[PDB]
Design a protein around this nucleic acid. Structure first.
Ligand SMILES: [Mg+2]
Ligand SMILES: [Mg+2]
Ligand SMILES: [Mg+2]
Ligand SMILES: [Mg+2]
Ligand SMILES: [Mg+2]
Ligand SMILES: [Mg+2]
Ligand SMILES: [Mg+2]
Ligand SMILES: [Mg+2]
Ligand SMILES: [Mg+2]
Ligand SMILES: [Mg+2]
Ligand SMILES: [Mg+2]
Ligand SMILES: [Mg+2]
Ligand SMILES: [Mg+2]
Ligand SMILES: [Mg+2]
Ligand SMILES: [Mg+2]
Ligand SMILES: [Mg+2]
Ligand SMILES: [Mg+2]
Ligand SMILES: [Mg+2]
Ligand SMILES: [Mg+2]
Ligand SMILES: [Mg+2]
Ligand SMILES: [Mg+2]
Ligand SMILES: [Mg+2]
Ligand SMILES: [Mg+2]
Ligand SMILES: [Mg+2]
Ligand SMILES: [Mg+2]
Ligand SMILES: [Mg+2]
Ligand SMILES: [Mg+2]
Ligand SMILES: [Mg+2]
Lengths: 77, 149
RNA sequence: UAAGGUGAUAUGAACCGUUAUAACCGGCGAUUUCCGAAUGGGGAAACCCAGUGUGUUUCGACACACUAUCAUUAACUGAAUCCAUAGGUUAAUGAGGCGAACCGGGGGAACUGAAACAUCUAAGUACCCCGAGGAAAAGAAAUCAACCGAGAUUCCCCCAG
RNA sequence: AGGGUGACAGCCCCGUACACAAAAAUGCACAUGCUGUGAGCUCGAUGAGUAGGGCGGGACACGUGGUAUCCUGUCUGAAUA
RNA sequence: UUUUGUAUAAUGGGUCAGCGACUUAUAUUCUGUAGCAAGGUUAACCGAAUAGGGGAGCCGAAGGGAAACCGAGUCUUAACUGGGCGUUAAGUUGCAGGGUAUAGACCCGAAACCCGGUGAUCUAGCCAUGGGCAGGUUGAAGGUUGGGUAACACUAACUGGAGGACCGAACCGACUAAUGUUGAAAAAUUAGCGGAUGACUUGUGGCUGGGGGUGAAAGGCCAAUCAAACCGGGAGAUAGCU
RNA sequence: GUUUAUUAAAAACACAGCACUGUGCAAACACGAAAGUGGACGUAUACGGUGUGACGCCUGCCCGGUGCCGGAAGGUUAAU
RNA sequence: UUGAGCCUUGAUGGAAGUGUGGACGCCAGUCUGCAUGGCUUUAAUGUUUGAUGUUCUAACGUUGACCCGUAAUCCGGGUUGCGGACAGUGUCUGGUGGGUAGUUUGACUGGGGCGGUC
RNA sequence: AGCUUGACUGCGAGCGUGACGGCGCGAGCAGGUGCGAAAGCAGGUCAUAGUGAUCCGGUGGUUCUGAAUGGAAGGGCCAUC
């Protein structure tokens, strides 16, 4: 499931629009990546499936806080 | 990604300076490998407080015994001397514990030769005021009275 | 509640009753094979086959109960690694499946209209999917108004085709 | 009111207007008990990868239009009564 | 019925009985009618419930101009001798009806497009595991022995038993004719015919799904149907045609 | 040998053989939003695509067009 | 390494003699330094800012080997080897794109088509 | 041939001709102009072909409009592409 584990970011639907303005069902979908983060709080690599941005969020809020969620939300990690 | 440093660190490092680095270098190497930390503001005082409770705190905690020579601003009682010689001139030298002999009962008792004047120590009158090693900055002042016997 | 009763086709038989345990109606209980979410394993539904506990003046065997999965918690265990995590067993709780419409959400057509047709329409319709309640959803202004003032959301009539 | 009874019944029958009824299980109200649960005053605090923006889309009656407002796939990113 | 025109040898009807097609809703205008009249009338809602309340509002009594504006006038133009549109006719609300608009809009009928399902018990291909091929021919390589070469080559008997090999039943097929053609049979019967140890034939079970499969390729086959299966839905698709 | 089961069995399809062309293996290619899978438990004497069609004798000229291959200069040229 | 800016120490805006590389040097100078002797035209650094190139490892890949969960050709964690900011993927974007899709492809007419005409 | 810009601006009684959209002719009125001594003549060319509705958009002009208010964008109106 292309779903960013930190921000909930799943794929979405929209059109295409040609020059003719021709509608065509498509998807936009997240720039996911899954990345080995180091915790130190747990001496381990918890390797989330993350969208960049998700990344930027960890890079600000802090992994210990991001895993604080998930845990608090039920998610595995 | 600004973050603050812990250890040195090549082209920016400085035990706690305020750097601004590419996000990768940091979330891939610097942090999670003990070298830096997000500049989470919470921290820019957490590592700026020290910069006060230290570089302006313990750099003042040093000043509590000015010149160390406080009430010894009137010389010290001359118990004995420091020797003499050459029937009028000088001849004898200071053993590795022989500048105390005179000021040998004032402050606290020690016995070491932290030599300061790397010369043949001038041989004339007697009473002189140079400095001696009292600390990595300050000094002290006293004199030397010979012995006539 | 009662002088009549043992559902029907549908008699007959053998019976039950008549002052209160005949029958009839209602409240609460008991019983409730097998299949079916089916949940001990399996399986071509209503069948096949177990493990562990029990249980017999005939304690062979054969009858009765428990044993699915998942989530939360707890106890006891316990790797690469020695700590620790993972993993492992047990237990207590809960979930599962079904079913009208209404409801919220995730996806989402075409015929057809435009007298052709692609923007546009049909239409966020049909349909698929997930979830929930007696309703749902929404909701106490970073809302409107217009120099006066109004005071959440929902619904109805107007404004106005 | 209505139905039935050997043809069309206020008075033949069952009903109907009206007045009554529960040993039990429940519904809803209240008055109480139990477990909780928090109440009032004073001093604070006042929701950042957010608002905004580039790009692509989608929602607003509004088809990018001169186009405000809202949602965000992507890239960025403030102020702090 | 349709046509310029049908006894027409152009359409439909074997006959009877029953059913079978211009409706309904909301707007809108007109006629009829009734009320009230420079006014008419309320909607939701309240309700004492077909009363009464409610006048929010709608239409009408003012028009001209794109408009600001002006106003029985106004616009045009610098201005009109003028010119355009207006001032001189009553409305409005019910009720019945005639049109129209939006809805399936008088009824029945396509071939089709789209969504979601059910189908490899027919058949194509493939996978696993099983089965079948009477009888008769031809006689490959190789081998043995002779003859032969200096030695090989070669050569003769024999031996051997090859082949999408020959002939022919079973079995698989399907070339011709006749019969059948309200059939015995929605593809057959009869006499002939091709293959018949192979790229063979067959049982059981399996997998491949609809713009998809499978195809020794015919657009063949995918349950008596295939230039896009069947079933249900969109759905009363649409039908300037009959 | 195969084929239009049910109006076409053929000169049509297939064929062994020949050529062209792709593919260094996590192959090309193919099923598949993906994971996974065939190709293949194969590895260029292999695997795919396309054409031709045993065998004999052979297979000439044309690169303008179309298609394909190669090109590190310039011209033109997108988001940004 | 390299295009350009800023900071700087040498160029344009403790004497004379016995001695040296580079040079627009008005066309024949004298210099810019090299030894000594009782705000604007020039070279190197510290640098700030982009380009190019090497390498690194530490994102990331591993359809090599090993360890454990585990008697397991999955998966996960771990070690190691190889690769490595490449590859790949998200968004945006130019090209290609009958592979697939929706359609269009007029009327008149001595039937239709062709021709012709509008 | 001379002088010239009437190939003028606002209008227009009243006719023609069209299903319509429209097209045509027109003396006369106001302002201003050329030619002529003057009467007068000129709102193109002897007449009848020489053409393209609407929408969208451009340019000039014009406060007519302008979503709290002043502006502006946009819109209208006139001209023209
Ligand atoms: Mg069972
Ligand atoms: Mg079961
Ligand atoms: Mg269509
Ligand atoms: Mg149409
Ligand atoms: Mg609620
Ligand atoms: Mg106020
Ligand atoms: Mg707040
Ligand atoms: Mg006729
Ligand atoms: Mg006649
Ligand atoms: Mg007839
Ligand atoms: Mg089969
Ligand atoms: Mg044979
Ligand atoms: Mg034969
Ligand atoms: Mg036969
Ligand atoms: Mg054909
Ligand atoms: Mg068929
Ligand atoms: Mg169908
Ligand atoms: Mg129909
Ligand atoms: Mg429909
Ligand atoms: Mg043959
Ligand atoms: Mg046939
Ligand atoms: Mg035949
Ligand atoms: Mg090949
Ligand atoms: Mg051929
Ligand atoms: Mg040939
Ligand atoms: Mg040739
Ligand atoms: Mg096509
Ligand atoms: Mg025609």
């Amino acid at each position: 499931s292309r779903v960013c584990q930190v921000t909930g970011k799943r794929p979405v639907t929209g059109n295409n629009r040609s020059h003719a303005l021709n509608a065509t069902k498509r998807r936009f979908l997240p720039n996911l990546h899954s990345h080995r983060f180091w915790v130190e709080s747990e001496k381990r690599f918890v390797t989330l499936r993350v969208s960049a941005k998700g990344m930027r969020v960890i890079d600000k809020k802090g992994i210990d806080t991001v895993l604080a969620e998930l845990r608090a939300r039920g998610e595995k990690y | 990604m600004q973050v603050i440093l812990l250890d040195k660190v090549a082209n920016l490092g400085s035990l706690g300076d305020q750097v601004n680095v590419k996000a990768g270098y940091a979330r891939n190497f610097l942090v999670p490998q003990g070298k830096a930390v997000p500049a989470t503001k919470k921290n820019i005082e957490f590592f700026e407080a020290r910069r006060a409770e230290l570089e302006a705190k313990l750099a003042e905690v040093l000043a509590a015994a000015n010149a160390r020579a406080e009430k010894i601003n009137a010389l010290e009682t001359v118990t004995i001397a420091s020797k003499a010689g050459d029937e009028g001139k000088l001849f004898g030298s200071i053993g590795t514990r022989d500048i105390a002999d005179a000021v040998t009962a004032a402050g606290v008792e020690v016995a070491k030769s932290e030599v300061r004047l790397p010369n043949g120590v001038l041989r004339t009158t007697g009473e002189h005021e140079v400095s001696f090693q009292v600390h990595s900055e300050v000094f002290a002042k006293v004199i030397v009275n010979v012995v006539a016997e």
